[PDB]
RNA sequence: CGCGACCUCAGAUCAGACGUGGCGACCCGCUGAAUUUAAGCAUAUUAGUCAGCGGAGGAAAAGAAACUAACCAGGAUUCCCUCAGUAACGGCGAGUGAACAGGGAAGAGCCCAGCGCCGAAUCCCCGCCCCGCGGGGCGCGGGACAUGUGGCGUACGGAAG
RNA sequence: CCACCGGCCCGUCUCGCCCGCCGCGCCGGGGAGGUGGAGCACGAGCGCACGUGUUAGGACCCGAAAGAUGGUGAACUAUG
RNA sequence: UGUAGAAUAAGUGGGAGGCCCGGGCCGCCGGUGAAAUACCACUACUCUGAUCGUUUUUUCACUGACCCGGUGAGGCGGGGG
């Protein structure tokens, strides 16, 4: 989720997608997990 | 990195590169031009882009267009007066190298009679193969009337072996609506070739003649 | 009752050695702006309620004589726990070598200093 | 009100405040002994919804067992059978390690019954599991008669039989198409039905 | 330094109670070949069976859907006839081999963790009476379990106020 | 009943034009030939029993050198 | 930095005007070659330069997992004499 995070705040959600897919089982899950965690990333760092 | 090829978009970056500095107002009339940037392509093996793009609205110019050969074709070129020469003084073209680009560089597009294609890489030979103007081969007893019609609008698109090609779509003093249509009939020629996508296009520069680049939203 | 928001004073017990069955009620009673206290002493607390370990103690309803003296504690414990919070979470605790190891480095920096002046 | 924060710290176990404990424990329980009994359960919630109601006769066994498939016991790879059958090194014996446990528990304790067990720990070799079980002759539990089933006496070692929860997630039942392979109680039971060629009087 | 409180623990010919060993025809959990077949033989087959080991009762196991289906829909589990020697597996060879629909036999559903409400309203042990036999069960005082969570109300068909 | 021709259904192939309209379409239906089929062309099965033959089963009877599983032996002998 | 061109031509494409205060400079023309600049945009390698970082490799180092020895686990590390 960390690695993630940084993955996703910077470069590309293609590759962090990829990451999340080898990580957890299945593409649907690492949908979630991206919307998520893109969720959870807009809200801290455009929270100010 | 984000890129559409929607309308209004187009559009408000067409008014913004209009109202660049004010009005860059100088005493020459501003010509649009339009720069595409272009990825993952090889054309080191075969993807080379080469086509004929014929600008609906206004091609700036109306193009100096010269024809050679001779018949009933050639006095309906002198019929419109597009200028026209005939065999001698292509044998006199023969005897100087530079008055090959003489009548290169004063006359913009090449059109020639199906007869004489056999001559005119020997007389014209250095000039118009090497710089890319090799003219264009023509029907014995044409109308010339619809193909001088066509290739006032009608322009080339060749990105060659390069990565970018950039192509001028009109003036300024034409109507604002035109030029954006200008540059949807360019646009489509790559949407037309490429087979998954436009996202070959991360950016594409629109510009006046020489304001401020604008990239594509 | 932290959750309802009815209790005005929560006690936590120190020792309790499932630490899980305590760490979420820090953050809380943080949250929910009960005033909470750390107390040392698990078996302390059962001496109170007639048991042997007790965990949680809470303050919820006060006679009249107490309402005085209880506010006077939540004043220091707001001192202390709460208003400290955002300070407390971002201290690690413990990473403390051996006193052999860290009079070993010692010494060798008197030895560094011999080198220095 | 509490043991939902209970179950849900637990419950993302891969967090940096979590893993100090497993940590923690993992050693601790590493230096102790292989069997031992526990005073009261690591997790209370946990080993509560599994059936632990903290009163007199509800006894907390830690085990531990080591990891690996297991190495078919024939000497020096000599398996003496086709080519099928040569590999040694790799059989991974169907029955999972919580049920192993399981067994180890109630035969070195066959007066007790058990009921179930639950994950507590690993870290390269050792495996560690908590198994409630439950006292059989103690008045708590022969009263109060929710409970009397594992005291009538149909239920003795039931880790041997496989009745509990990783014993049925071995021996897979469940029902639909993805369990033809054991039509009716086990795959020995469908195996007796179907190719037992049955022969009537009349035929 | 002493004392006290727990928490981890040991000891005892402590008070009381329990497990081991057998028979194994049927059942349950694992492990597990090879003869043979294929005219040879390596996958296959013999078979997840003989042998081995651990368990259990008068039955056991299974079981109230993380189901079957795809249309006018059925409805826990078990057993029989059909499905069917079929769909399918297979040096697509020898061979292997289901299931839901259908009709019968039997008919049965339930509880707890969680959630919250009730002042721990709960249970065990000891001691005295209570009572009547063939023989043991309710009530009253003090020692414990237990607030890291007894009991009542409660289960996905909704439940509570 | 035999032999042949003609007819019909299904799969494909070839050549062709017409019709239908719960919706006008890379939609259906149709025609004429030559072919592959375990077909139709007024149906003969099903159940029982007996006989013969073939196959799987210890299978007409007896027969091997082998292989696997699990156990019992160092009282003769071998060597500490 | 093959050759020619005043000029190390990376490339495309617009292109007769651009820059600035009646005017000058650059470009056009001449001339090169096969391809020519002004003004304008992108696409590239060849290196330099900084860090929210990023990772792995390497370098040493500490000990608390783990391992190795010995004891009837007998004086260890600091600080005082
Ligand atoms: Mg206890
Ligand atoms: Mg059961
Ligand atoms: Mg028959
Ligand atoms: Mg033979
Ligand atoms: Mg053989
Ligand atoms: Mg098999
Ligand atoms: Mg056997
Ligand atoms: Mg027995
Ligand atoms: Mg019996
Ligand atoms: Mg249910
Ligand atoms: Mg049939
Ligand atoms: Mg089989
Ligand atoms: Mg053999
Ligand atoms: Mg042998
Ligand atoms: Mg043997
Ligand atoms: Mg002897």
Same mark, same amino acid.
């Given at each position: ?48 | ?28 009339? $501003? ?44 006095? $309906?070129?002198? =019929? ?7 065999? $001698? ?22 059109? =020639?009679? $199906? ?30 009337? =619809? ?20 192509? =001028? ?49 | ?16 050695? &499932? ?6 009620? &820090? ?7 009960? &005033? ?69 480095? *010692? ?9 220095? *002046? | ?7 849900? +710290? ?7 405040? /979590?893993?100090? +404990? ?90 007790? %019954?058990? +009921? ?41 070692? %039931?880790? /041997? ?43």
């Amino acid at each position: 989720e960390r690695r993630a995070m940084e993955l996703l705040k910077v470069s590309k959600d293609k590759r962090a997608l990829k990451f999340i897919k080898k990580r957890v089982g299945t593409h649907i899950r690492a949908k979630r997990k991206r919307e998520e965690l893109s969720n959870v990333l807009a809200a801290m760092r455009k929270a100010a | 990195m984000s890129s559409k090829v929607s309308r209004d978009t187009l559009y408000e970056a067409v008014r913004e590169v209009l109202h660049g500095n004010q009005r860059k107002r100088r005493k020459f009339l $501003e010509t649009v031009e339009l720069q595409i940037s272009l990825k993952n392509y090889d054309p080191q093996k075969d993807k080379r882009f080469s086509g004929t793009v014929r600008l609906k609205s206004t091609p700036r110019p109306k193009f100096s267009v010269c024809v050679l050969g001779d018949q009933q074709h050639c006095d $309906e070129a002198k =019929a419109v007066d597009i200028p026209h020469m005939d065999i $001698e003084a292509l044998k006199k073209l023969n005897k100087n190298k530079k008055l090959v680009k003489k009548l290169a560089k004063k006359y913009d597009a090449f059109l =020639a009679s $199906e007869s004489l294609i056999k001559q005119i890489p020997r007389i014209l030979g250095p000039g118009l193969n090497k710089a890319g103007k090799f003219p264009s081969l023509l029907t014995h007893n044409e109308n010339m009337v =619809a193909k001088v019609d066509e290739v006032k609008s009608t322009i080339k698109f060749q990105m060659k072996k390069v990565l970018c090609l950039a192509v =001028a779509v009109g003036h300024v003093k034409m109507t604002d609506d035109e030029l954006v249509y200008n540059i949807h009939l360019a646009v489509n020629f790559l949407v037309s070739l490429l087979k998954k996508n436009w996202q070959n296009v991360r950016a594409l520069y629109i510009k006046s003649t020489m304001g401020k680049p604008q990239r594509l939203y | 009752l932290v959750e309802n928001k009815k209790a005005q004073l929560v006690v936590i017990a120190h020792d309790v050695d &499932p630490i899980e069955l305590v760490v979420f009620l &820090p953050a809380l009673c943080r949250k929910m702006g009960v &005033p909470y206290c750390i107390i040392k002493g698990k078996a302390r607390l059962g001496r109170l309620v007639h048991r042997k370990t007790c965990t949680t103690v809470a303050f919820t309803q006060v006679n009249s004589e107490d309402k005085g003296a209880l506010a006077k504690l939540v004043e220091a414990i707001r001192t202390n726990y709460n208003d400290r919070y955002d300070e407390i979470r971002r201290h690690w605790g413990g990473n403390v070598l051996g006193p052999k190891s860290v009079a070993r480095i *010692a010494k060798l920096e008197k030895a560094k200093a011999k080198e220095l *002046a | 009100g509490a043991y939902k924060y209970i179950q849900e +710290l637990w419950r993302k176990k891969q967090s940096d405040v /979590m893993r100090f +404990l497993l940590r923690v424990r993992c050693w601790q329980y590493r230096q102790l002994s292989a069997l031992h009994r526990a005073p009261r359960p690591t997790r209370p919630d946990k080993a509560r919804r599994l059936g632990y109601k903290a009163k007199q006769g509800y006894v907390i066994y830690r085990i531990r067992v080591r990891r690996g498939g297991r190495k078919r016991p024939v000497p020096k790879g000599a398996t003496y059978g086709k080519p099928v059958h040569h590999g040694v090194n790799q059989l991974k014996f169907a029955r999972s390690l919580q049920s192993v446990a399981e067994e180890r528990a109630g035969r070195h304790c066959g007066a007790l %019954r058990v +009921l179930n067990s639950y994950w507590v720990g690993e870290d390269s070799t050792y495996k560690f599991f908590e198994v409630i079980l439950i006292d059989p002759f103690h008045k708590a539990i022969r009263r109060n008669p929710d409970t009397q089933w594992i005291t009538k006496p149909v239920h003795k070692h %039931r880790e /041997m039989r496989g009745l509990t929860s990783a014993g049925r997630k071995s021996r897979g039942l469940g029902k639909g198409h993805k369990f033809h392979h054991t039509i009716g109680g086990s795959r020995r039971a469908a195996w007796r039905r179907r190719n037992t060629l049955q022969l009537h009087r009349y035929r």
